[PDB]
Amino acid sequence: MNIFEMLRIDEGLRLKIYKDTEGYYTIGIGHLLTKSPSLNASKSELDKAIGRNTNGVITKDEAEKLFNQDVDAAVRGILRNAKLKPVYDSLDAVRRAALINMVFQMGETGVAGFTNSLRMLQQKRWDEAAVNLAKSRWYNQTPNRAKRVITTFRTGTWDAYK
Ligand SMILES: [Cl-]
Numbered sequence: 001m002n003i004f005e006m007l008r009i010d011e012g013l014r015l016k017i018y019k020d021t022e023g024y025y026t027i028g029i030g031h032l033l034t035k036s037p038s039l040n041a042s043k044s045e046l047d048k049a050i051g052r053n054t055n056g057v058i059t060k061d062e063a064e065k066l067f068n069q070d071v072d073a074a075v076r077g078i079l080r081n082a083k084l085k086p087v088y089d090s091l092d093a094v095r096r097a098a099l100i101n102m103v104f105q106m107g108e109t110g111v112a113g114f115t116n117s118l119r120m121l122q123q124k125r126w127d128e129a130a131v132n133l134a135k136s137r138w139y140n141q142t143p144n145r146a147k148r149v150i151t152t153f154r155t156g157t158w159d160a161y162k
């Protein structure tokens, strides 16, 4: 198991524009297009992201290409962020993947705000961090995915994904 496989399970794959859990226009493997309520605006963002007149449909390779860019972006975002970098650096390989998952979902800013949880993780207080992580909108809105990520941090294994 690795970050790509992990996120592919969490986000799924859709080749046609769809609305995510929040009602936002998305495509491929969790690639957010726009938060705007306009389908056309999303089709325009899509064409701009792909480099062609897509007409709201993309191929598998194209979806995969957006995914590679998005994962790379998340990692680089973490490394550039003063609040995240130190945590990331303190973690083992598996938990690093859990941190990347959250950033991919909520954006670096979003995650940077789980101040207390971040400190617990850095301290290696696994059980406490899992408890703190659960008291959040994130957990309440996407409980199954959140549970998978939290188990990952708590155990340091890929058990929730097997
Ligand atoms: Cl893009």
Ligand SMILES: [Cl-]
Binding pocket: 141, 142, 143, 144, 145, 146
């Ligand atoms: Cl869920």
